[PDB]
Amino acid sequence: HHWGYGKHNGPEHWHKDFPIAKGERQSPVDIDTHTAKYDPSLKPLSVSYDQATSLRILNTGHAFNVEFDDSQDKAVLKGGPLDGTYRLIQFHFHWGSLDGQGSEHTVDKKKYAAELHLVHWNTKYGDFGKAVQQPDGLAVLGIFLKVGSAKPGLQKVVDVLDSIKTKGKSADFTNFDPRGLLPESLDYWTYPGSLTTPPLLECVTWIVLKEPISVSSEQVLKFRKLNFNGEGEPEELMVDNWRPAQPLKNRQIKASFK
Ligand SMILES: [Zn+2]
Numbered sequence: 442h443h444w445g446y447g448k449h450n451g452p453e454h455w456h457k458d459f460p461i462a463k464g465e466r467q468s469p470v471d472i473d474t475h476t477a478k479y480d481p482s483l484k485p486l487s488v489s490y491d492q493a494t495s496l497r498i499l500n501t502g503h504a505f506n507v508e509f510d511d512s513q514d515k516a517v518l519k520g521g522p523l524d525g526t527y528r529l530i531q532f533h534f535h536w537g538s539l540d541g542q543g544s545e546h547t548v549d550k551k552k553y554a555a556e557l558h559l560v561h562w563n564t565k566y567g568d569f570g571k572a573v574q575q576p577d578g579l580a581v582l583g584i585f586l587k588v589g590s591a592k593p594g595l596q597k598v599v600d601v602l603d604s605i606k607t608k609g610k611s612a613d614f615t616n617f618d619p620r621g622l623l624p625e626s627l628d629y630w631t632y633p634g635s636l637t638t639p640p641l642l643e644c645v646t647w648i649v650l651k652e653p654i655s656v657s658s659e660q661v662l663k664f665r666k667l668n669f670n671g672e673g674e675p676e677e678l679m680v681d682n683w684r685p686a687q688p689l690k691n692r693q694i695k696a697s698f699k
Pocket of ligand 1: 534
């Protein structure tokens, strides 16, 4: 059967269809802050989202993706541990059924309520499909969400979820500015990893921001109203769509701050 986050098709079963699940550079991982190495050679991140053009929001059956026009670099990520230009193609979240879980990466074993993933691909490879086949093909910016004060810039996303409740549903979602989802500081940890959902390709340079953003209980509650199922099928609430931490193995996590 198709992979998912249930008891019979969850993360522990993925290796049967995707052997790379037991690979050498799988994600997510636990970030041990005392073992992370401060690297003074790491450059500051350069986030240019002023010309971003959002197009649509889609319920993929595993999460909801906000898609962007990536036919030109209008929204790009550069600098940091990256060499070259990476174009933003989509962002999505992972969340839990309770505020005490939901994030994929953890910090000193601490789990956050959710995790935002801004996915970018290396322009030198021409298209997203080619990029995922390369070790330096993608750059994913990870941002933790803690429950507290509401995040104004996230509300437009929250209000449209009713229209894409079930798998396969999509809605026009134009003029959304992703800058409203970024924390004040851009200090980060970085390590070589993989996509956290099948095909689990090891083509990602992970950039995880140290500063979480705050969202209200009401905002996260609305995420939990989505469905894994398609319309007309038995209702399965979309919650706990996160993969647990994987072995770090032969990898070093570097920090841009000390
Ligand atoms: Zn993700």
